[PDB]
Symmetry: C2
Subunit: 134 residues, 2 copies
């Protein structure tokens, strides 16, 4: 779990690294959210469901949320697809359902989450149907 990645910037200094640290950090943030919304400063309501979250975490993966939180402010998004998108932000894993994949694309593009957009593009590429707009 530990590693002397580098023998330190100077003399007598050592630089360690905990490889699992970012994974555990996100896991603990996700456990905060799912256990009552500990330390969460935003409640996201989609339909009949409310989602607690951390503004800093949404801003770190979404240009849309980053800007909305900084400004104090056709493409409907369902709570199920939005819950999958939150799950990806907090776990690095997203479920792609074919029956609701059009909704996922709509949400990913509106929320400007590059990683989810790249996953959508990968699903599109695997269909072998390339879309060229001259």
């Amino acid at each position: 779990a530990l590693e002397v990645l580098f023998q330190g910037p100077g003399s007598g200094c050592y630089t360690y690294q905990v490889s699992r640290h970012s994974t555990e950090m996100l896991h603990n943030l996700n456990q905060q959210r799912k256990n009552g919304g500990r330390f969460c400063d935003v409640l996201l309501r989609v339909g009949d469901e409310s989602f607690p979250a951390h503004r800093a975490v949404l801003a770190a993966c979404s240009e849309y949320f980053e800007s909305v939180f900084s400004a104090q402010l056709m493409h409907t998004i369902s709570s199920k697809v939005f819950g999958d998108i939150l799950d990806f932000a907090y776990t690095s894993r997203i479920v792609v359902r074919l029956e609701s994949f059009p909704e996922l694309m709509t949400a990913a593009k509106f929320l400007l989450m590059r990683s989810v957009i790249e996953i959508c593009q990968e699903v599109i590429k695997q269909s072998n149907v390339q879309i060229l707009v001259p």
Copy 2:
């Protein structure tokens, strides 16, 4: 960067994973902190220096900070060692300086950060001087 980790919980569903996501998430949180303290809700003052941070991030790696933030509340800690400890929480990497290693142990134990305590124990183990208290 993408991976079909699993062929989905059900039928027609697919489960993707972005392995670099937790690393990028922490990196973006760290860039928030270092660029003016964006989305930071706590200012940590040690001596002549102030450190902005996210309460949720400190709580996720420190039992001490988790409890202090939830309760609204001999072992002095310097700003330099404390800045290295913040750096570890936000980057997964810590610099161990021998001249200030007693301060690091004091801070790691008071802040109850297991990963930093485990690094301290590893440095102790590498000295070949085992300390047994009967």
